[model samples]
Target: ARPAFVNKLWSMVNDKSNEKFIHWSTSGESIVVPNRERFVQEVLPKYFKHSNFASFVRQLNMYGWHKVQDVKSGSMLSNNDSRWEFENERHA
Candidate 1:
């Protein structure tokens, strides 16, 4: 069973209505925030008090999540698209 700590986030990640806004990565052990602006305005606000995406990311980092470098996704190496991906400390 997932601990309550992760369950809270898990609830949001797997929500179908929010899928287009935010969801788990293909592996199910990671998170992909495809649309930052819409997610911040519509998605994250429901779970967090702030609309600051950085703050949300900070919380994930503090919880031991890792920010992944999508080198293979495309050298998105410096592309301002701001596509975000983060993996868990432990796999599902």
Candidate 2:
């Protein structure tokens, strides 16, 4: 089963209590995957028209983030920043 990587990210961003921030903070006000399968099933078809799954992974990585297996949860795709995680308080 494809573990819901985006479900985790969505949960993190929406959690007002956590005070976490993504590495792509400067790229946008909020980060979103919209649909985890969008690249595979949407963007590629709409744009490339003939790209495959391997290309999808490459494009996604170039855009920052690649799939990974979480120690406790399962598969998750997120930024590569080693320090990318929650802090104690929200930025001012």
Q: Which of the numbered candidates is closest to the native, going by highest TM-score?
A: 1
Model 1 gets an lDDT of 0.69
Whole-model lDDT per candidate: 0.69, 0.41
lDDT of 1 by residue, 24-45 (tens): 7786877887787787788767
Measured with C-alpha atoms, the lDDT of residue 82 in candidate 1 is 61
Q: Which parts of model 2 have CA positions greater than 4 angstroms off?
A: 1-39, 73-92
* Leading candidate by lDDT: 1
* Superposition error at 8 for model 1 (Å): 0.8
Candidate 1's TM-score = 0.69
For all candidates, the clash counts are: 0, 0
Instruction: Report the poorest 10 consecutive residues by lDDT, candidate 2.
Output: 83-92
